[PDB]
Design a protein around this nucleic acid. Structure first.
Lengths: 103, 117, 45, 158
DNA sequence: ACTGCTTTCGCATGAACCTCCCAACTACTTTTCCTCACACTTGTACTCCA
DNA sequence: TGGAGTACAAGTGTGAGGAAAAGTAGTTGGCGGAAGTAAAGCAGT
């Protein structure tokens, strides 16, 4: 293997500033994870970790989802985004996992 | 003491122009200038009937890149350079074939005295 | 590439890098103009 | 110092200093022309005209341990093997190794043939090695008090 | 004349170097990789000022 | 009532920036005169 290909395989620096999200956007753009697979983030299994992360009362698990359900597209389905478009990183917070944190 | 040759080309040291410090008789001698016909390529501007008379035809990039510049008598002298550039492309890239009877199997229509020289 | 540049050193050309003037009309980016060499010569010797 | 200050199941500290001065003791000339990165001399290199700091620390630490363990001839033969013909600090400890011998041999616990003319070598070694320490560069010893320590070793002899 | 300086000789046979170029130890270029920020322009929102 | 515009926020064009293993280079160390007895032609005064 060459000196650059054997340096790209060892992961010297871990993904930062949303580097890992933007690679999913390229991955959902070269192959269509949309329209073939269920691009539905299990957002109920996300917040249960986020409930037990900082020891908040479990009332906030259902205080959150009604805020999510009120401000959402078709109530449910925080759909995972695709980018076949270009080297432009959507600043819309199009990433479905990124949207649950702001809620 | 001088047979076992130098890497430097036969230059022209007292010349002041860069096209003059490289003499035209050094790389290709004055006898081999008239063993090449010049009108077989310039009269036919064609995509196949100009590539047909090259010694090493290939699907490469640089070979058909500098060829499609102009059809002008200024590059008539440099037209045989590209014909002799492509003939030197067959010699360096082959190190396992050590004869001439197998040299035809990689080329198509090689020259007469330029190959043996 | 550096196997090719060492062949020109016997000739005597000062193989140096390109310029930003020699960057736009040659298909190479302006920032990565260091690994992209241009070999000229000097007319007395 | 984490080995020497530990003293629970320590490697005594001094054996690590011996490890350093076996594989990093160089005799290269310090070239001073190349730009240096990642090695910087005054605590980690060992070229000519600079005895390394782990080398001279190996000398002093194996002399203090040599005194606390009362083997003195091992170190005095060990320091004998390099002549560092540039500096003065290894000559002073090579002087001080004999001065500690002249201290211990001059007890004599009487209340007498070879024990007298043995010590008179060590008195002579200190007066020469301190003299050759002064012959070298700047290493300002108390060359007055150390003479006054040898005279007290001859008053024990008389 | 006898001068000097030659010179030939010897017991068998057995055994009885000098540049130079390669090495260690460093640094600095080499030869291709993936990862986004920036500069505008059309667009939709703002509140006019008579 | 109406249109001005100025903003706000969206959309398109374009190469500059951080990374590592190989390589190169860059400079040293280091190696392979108490021997005899005798003749001779050559010199000397």
């Amino acid at each position: 293997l060459p000196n650059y290909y054997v340096s790209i395989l060892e992961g010297s620096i871990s993904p930062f500033n949303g580097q890992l999200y933007n690679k999913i956007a390229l991955t959902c753009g070269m192959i269509h994870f949309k329209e073939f697979f269920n691009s539905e983030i299990s957002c109920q299994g996300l917040l249960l970790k986020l409930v037990m992360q900082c020891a908040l009362p479990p009332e906030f698990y259902f205080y959150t989802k009604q805020v999510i359900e009120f401000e959402e597209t078709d109530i449910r389905n925080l759909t995972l985004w695709e980018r076949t478009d270009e080297r432009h990183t959507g600043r819309v917070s199009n990433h479905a996992e990124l949207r649950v944190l702001s809620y | 003491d001088e047979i076992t040759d130098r890497p430097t080309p036969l230059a022209n040291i007292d010349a002041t122009d860069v096209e003059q410090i490289y003499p035209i008789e050094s790389i290709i001698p004055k006898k081999e200038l008239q063993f090449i016909r010049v009108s077989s390529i310039l009269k036919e501007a064609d995509k196949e009937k100009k590539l047909e008379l090259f010694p090493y035809q290939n699907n490469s990039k640089y070979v058909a890149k500098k060829l499609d510049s102009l059809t002008q008598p200024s590059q008539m002298t440099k037209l045989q350079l590209l014909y002799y550039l492509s003939l030197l492309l067959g010699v360096y890239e082959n190190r396992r074939v050590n004869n001439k009877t197998k040299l035809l199997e990689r080329l198509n229509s090689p020259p007469e005295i330029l190959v043996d020289g | 590439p550096s196997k090719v540049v060492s062949l020109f050193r016997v000739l005597g050309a000062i193989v140096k890098g390109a310029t930003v003037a020699q960057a736009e009309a040659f298909g190479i980016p302006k920032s990565t103009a260091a690994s992209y060499k241009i070999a000229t010569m000097k007319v007395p010797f | 110092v984490e080995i020497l200050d530990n003293l629970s199941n320590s490697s005594s500290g001094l054996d690590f200093l011996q490890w350093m001065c076996q594989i990093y003791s160089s005799k290269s000339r310090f070239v001073q022309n190349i730009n240096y990165r990642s090695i910087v001399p005054p605590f980690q290199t060992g070229s000519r005209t600079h005895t390394a700091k782990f080398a001279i620390t190996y000398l002093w630490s194996s002399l203090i341990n040599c005194q606390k363990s009362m083997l003195i001839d091992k170190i005095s033969e060990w320091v004998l093997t390099p002549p560092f013909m540039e500096d003065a600090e290894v000559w002073f400890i090579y002087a001080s190794c004999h001065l500690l011998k002249a201290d211990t041999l001059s007890r004599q616990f009487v209340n007498r043939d070879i024990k007298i003319n043995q010590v008179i070598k060590h008195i002579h070694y200190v007066r020469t090695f301190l003299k050759i320490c002064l012959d070298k560069g700047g290493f300002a010893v108390p060359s007055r008090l150390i003479e006054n320590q040898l005279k007290s070793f001859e008053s024990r002899l008389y």
